[PDB]
Write an enzyme that holds these catalytic residues in place. Structure first.
Site, PDB file in Angstrom:
ATOM      1  N   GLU A   1       0.822  -1.207   0.000  1.00 40.61           N
ATOM      2  CA  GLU A   1       0.000   0.000   0.000  1.00 40.61           C
ATOM      3  C   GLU A   1       0.857   1.260   0.000  1.00 40.61           C
ATOM      4  OE1 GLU A   1      -2.987  -2.406  -0.529  1.00 40.61           O
ATOM      5  OE2 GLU A   1      -3.100  -0.215  -0.619  1.00 40.61           O
TER       6      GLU A   1
ATOM      7  N   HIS B   1     -15.999  -9.599 -11.430  1.00 37.38           N
ATOM      8  CA  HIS B   1     -15.521  -8.579 -12.358  1.00 37.38           C
ATOM      9  C   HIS B   1     -16.391  -8.482 -13.605  1.00 37.38           C
ATOM     10  CE1 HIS B   1     -12.090  -9.573  -9.785  1.00 37.38           C
ATOM     11  NE2 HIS B   1     -11.644  -8.355 -10.033  1.00 37.38           N
TER      12      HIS B   1
HETATM   13 ZN   LIG Z   1      -2.550  -2.472  -4.252  1.00 38.76          ZN
END
Ligand SMILES: [Zn+2]
Ligand SMILES: *[C@@H]1O[C@H](CO)[C@@H](O)[C@H](O)[C@H]1NC(C)=O
Ligand SMILES: *[C@@H]1O[C@H](CO)[C@@H](O)[C@H](O)[C@H]1NC(C)=O
Lengths: 195, 593
Positions: B354, B484
């Site tokens: 992150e 998705h």
């Molecule tokens: Zn990521």
């Protein structure tokens, strides 16, 4: 022992917008400049032409205190020989500037949750400002070739834009209060000495 | 009044207003994701609506600046992204029908249940838990066919109308179809030889598949033999793998087949979670360790407003939070990470992932608003994943005192690790390619409606080496049973970002002068590697992604050879392991046949 009213400039509740920057003429008083240049509450204290420790040992005819609010990444534009939106369209210092530029972070005063939008800046202008020129006009900017006739529209923009000051912004986008002190020396009384 | 200066004046007015409205939208969205109340849903909706309303209106003004007349490619890129109307090019009634369609398919997916021979399981977590953990053939079959015959069948008529309105939207935006519209994310128009057409993506993606097929065939053959041990009466040594035995509901990743396929079952995986707890690490220590890693490679540290505004733990008060890890670029130099971090090796690696997004966001923060993004849709995750690659290596874990100074990783756990990686990374590439290829040909009309299910399983056998355990007619819509597809997300992003991340790693590892196999490389303490990477990160999307890629790896081309080099020690192990096995598959065999 008439003391110079620096607290009126530095401790004002409100500060002006940079496009309509404020100017206070300081005259006929004694200024203790060590009060200011020995303060750690200023992130920027930059002088031109003069040296800080020598300010008490000096006399001038008039002294001008310009004050306004800009965001952090624009404080560098308040200096002789700079370019950018603030220096070109809002507040221009001359290349031979004689004085000092003082700034300090005011996130605690001028930012608000949801956003403060009182402070404005000039976004567009047909030409650069001459040093110490003030433009407070609100004429619609003609970015194209069709006249705007005072109507916002395609290639026709209102020239002023608001700052958005939230307390969670990064340091570069946080509001900073700036005070520019100009020291003028005419063949004249020289009324502001200030031991 | 030249064409360049008019549009730049427009972009200056756009940028000064976009930064405020986009910030208020990000802040309200942050206040909901970190404080889940009915009060903050409406604020997030209102703040999001006025930002969307603003962008729609600016998008229509922006179309009056013809791209052809602009000399400045940096100006041309900004107007281009702003001019992309998307669903706004449809009539207001047709956009509302599509919104209703997309919201019904998404609602059907997350509320779909499967009821056995009253008690019914949702996908999360009931049907999932079965598909990732069960080793029983008939229990996995009930969940697999149940999910596709109850949920996928509901999505079949809606997905047919979803294709019509999406192609209509793309045609209104002057594209072939919805598929060609998606491929526009990779369209580079720049200087000589950095050009990249939307149709060239098709050839690259197909060419990369042929180069990958040998490695995939050997991983496929090894998995097939291991599955034959556990399902001895259902598996054919030369046939495709039954679609319901692959480790999840769709076989996207083969990660959960590791207990059945681990090369050396007595060798445990290196898990340093105990060492972290033994040293009294907390979540601040984790993100501080991540910060030192990026500073070690020459990247800047986190801003002070990052530490103040981030949510690095699950709050100790009573507010409810979304715990899915995300890196937030709110604008105005406001970068945050929302994460319910625990003291584990998994969340230790996620912190590097992150924060890798954060380094990317900070690097291009001085770009104009419209150019603050990855070079293409696959760059952001590729950059984030290579950071966890270096941080997970025993060399790095040893250097931060998490692994013992004595530690020496033997060859068996090296093979165990590479096999575990290949189940996730290599196994998903044919699945990802074939899925988006089917959607591309459905949108293009090459696959007619009355052959959707026929072509879907003809390409599963052909490209993925996967066969359905139950014959499915055109009442089914099997791809729609994936999140998705039902939620209208492009899928090739997982194909390209995998190719990019190993080009980045090999390039940065060569710059750091690493010696040894690429999978043991740690880019820590190499300032030139981080500096080389930053020359791309700071570009944003202001340059063609081919040029941004070349500034790191030295090639303008999406190249899979770096991935093959990463898995070359495993391919060498697999060819010996498959010496008495069949490599390849025949598309004829069926478990129901
Ligand atoms: Zn990521
Ligand atoms: C959470 O949101 C409520 C309003 O929905 C607010 O009053 C409260 O102060 C928030 N709590 C925190 C810890 O921010
Ligand atoms: C494009 O415009 C920007 C801002 O006006 C400028 O910095 C850049 O040099 C220009 N590029 C070209 C090729 O004109």
């Amino acid at each position: 022992t008439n003391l110079c009213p620096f607290g009126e400039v530095f401790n004002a509740t409100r500060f002006a917008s940079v496009y309509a920057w404020n100017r206070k003429r300081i005259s006929n008083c004694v200024a203790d400049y060590s009060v200011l240049y020995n303060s750690a509450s200023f992130s920027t204290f930059k002088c031109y032409g003069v040296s800080p420790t020598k300010l008490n040992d000096l006399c001038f005819t008039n002294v001008y205190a310009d004050s306004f609010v800009i965001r952090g990444d624009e404080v560098r534009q308040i200096a002789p020989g700079q370019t950018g939106k603030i220096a070109d369209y809002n507040y221009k210092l001359p290349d031979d500037f004689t004085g000092c530029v003082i700034a300090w972070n005011s996130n605690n005063l001028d930012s608000k949750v949801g956003g403060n939008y009182n402070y404005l800046y000039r976004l567009f202008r047909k030409s650069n400002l001459k040093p110490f020129e003030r433009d407070i006009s609100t004429e619609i900017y003609q970015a194209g070739s069709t006249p705007c006739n005072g109507v916002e529209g395609f290639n026709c923009y209102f020239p002023l834009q608001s700052y958005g000051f939230q307390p969670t912004n990064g340091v570069g986008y946080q509001p900073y209060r700036v005070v520019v002190l100009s020291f003028e020396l005419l063949h004249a009384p020289a009324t502001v000495c200030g031991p | 009044s030249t064409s360049d200066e008019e549009a730049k004046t427009f972009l200056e007015k756009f940028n000064s207003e976009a930064e405020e409205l986009s910030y208020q939208s990000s802040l309200a969205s942050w206040n909901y994701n970190t404080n889940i109340t009915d009060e903050n849903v409406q604020k997030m909706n209102v703040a999001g609506a006025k930002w969307s309303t603003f962008y729609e209106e600016q998008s229509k003004i922006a179309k009056n600046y013809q791209l052809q007349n602009i000399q400045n490619d940096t100006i041309k890129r900004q107007l281009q992204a702003l001019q992309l109307s998307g669903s706004s090019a449809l009539s207001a009634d047709k956009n509302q029908r599509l919104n209703t369609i997309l919201n019904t398919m998404s609602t059907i997916y997350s509320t779909g249940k499967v009821c056995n021979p009253q008690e019914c399981s949702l996908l999360e977590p009931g049907l999932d838990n079965i598909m990732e953990s069960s080793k029983d053939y008939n229990e996995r079959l009930w969940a697999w066919e149940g999910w596709r015959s109850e949920v996928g069948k509901q999505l079949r008529p809606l997905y047919e109308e979803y294709v019509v309105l999406k192609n209509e939207m793309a045609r209104a935006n002057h594209y072939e179809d919805y598929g060609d519209y998606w491929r526009g994310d990779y369209e580079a128009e720049g200087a000589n030889g950095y050009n990249y057409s939307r149709d060239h993506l098709i050839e690259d993606v197909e060419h990369i598949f042929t180069q990958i097929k040998p490695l995939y065939e050997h991983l496929h053959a090894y998995v097939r033999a291991k599955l034959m041990d556990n399902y001895p009466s259902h598996i054919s040594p030369t046939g495709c793998l039954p679609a319901h035995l692959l480790g999840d509901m769709w076989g996207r990743f083969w990660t959960n087949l590791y207990p059945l396929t681990v090369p050396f079952r007595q060798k445990p995986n290196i898990d340093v979670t105990d060492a972290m707890v033994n040293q009294t690490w907390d979540a601040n220590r984790i993100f501080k360790e991540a910060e030192k890693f990026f500073v070690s490679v020459g990247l800047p540290k986190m801003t002070q407003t990052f530490w103040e505004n981030s949510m690095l733990t699950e709050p100790g008060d009573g507010r409810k939070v979304v715990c899915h890890p995300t890196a937030w670029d709110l604008g105005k130099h406001d970068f945050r990470i929302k994460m319910c971090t625990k003291v584990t090796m998994d969340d230790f690696l996620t912190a590097h992932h992150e924060m890798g997004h954060i380094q990317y966001d900070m690097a291009y923060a001085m770009q104009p608003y419209l150019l603050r993004n990855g070079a293409n849709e696959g760059f952001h995750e590729a950059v984030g994943e290579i950071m966890s690659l270096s941080a997970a290596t025993p060399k790095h874990l040893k250097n931060i005192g998490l692994l013992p100074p004595d530690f020496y990783e033997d060859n068996e756990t090296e093979i165990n690790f590479l096999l575990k990686q290949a189940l996730t990374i290599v196994g998903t590439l044919p699945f990802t390619y074939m899925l988006e290829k089917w959607r591309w040909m459905v949108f293009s009309g090459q696959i007619p409606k009355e052959q959707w299910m026929k072509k879907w399983w003809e390409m599963k056998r052909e490209i993925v080496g996967v066969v359905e355990p139950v014959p499915h007619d055109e009442t089914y819509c099997d791809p729609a049973s994936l999140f998705h597809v039902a939620n209208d997300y492009s899928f090739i992003r997982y194909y390209t970002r995998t190719i990019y991340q190993f080009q980045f790693q090999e390039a940065l590892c060569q710059t750091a002068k690493h010696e040894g196999p690429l999978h043991k490389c740690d880019i820590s303490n190499s300032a030139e590697a981080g500096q080389k990477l930053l020359q791309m990160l700071s570009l944003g999307k202001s340059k063609p992604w081919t040029l941004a890629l070349e500034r790191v790896v030295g090639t303008k081309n999406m190249d899979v050879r770096p991935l093959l080099n990463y898995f070359e020690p495993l391919l060498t192990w697999l060819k010996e392991q498959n010496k008495n096995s069949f490599v390849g598959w025949n598309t004829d065999w069926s478990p129901y046949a």
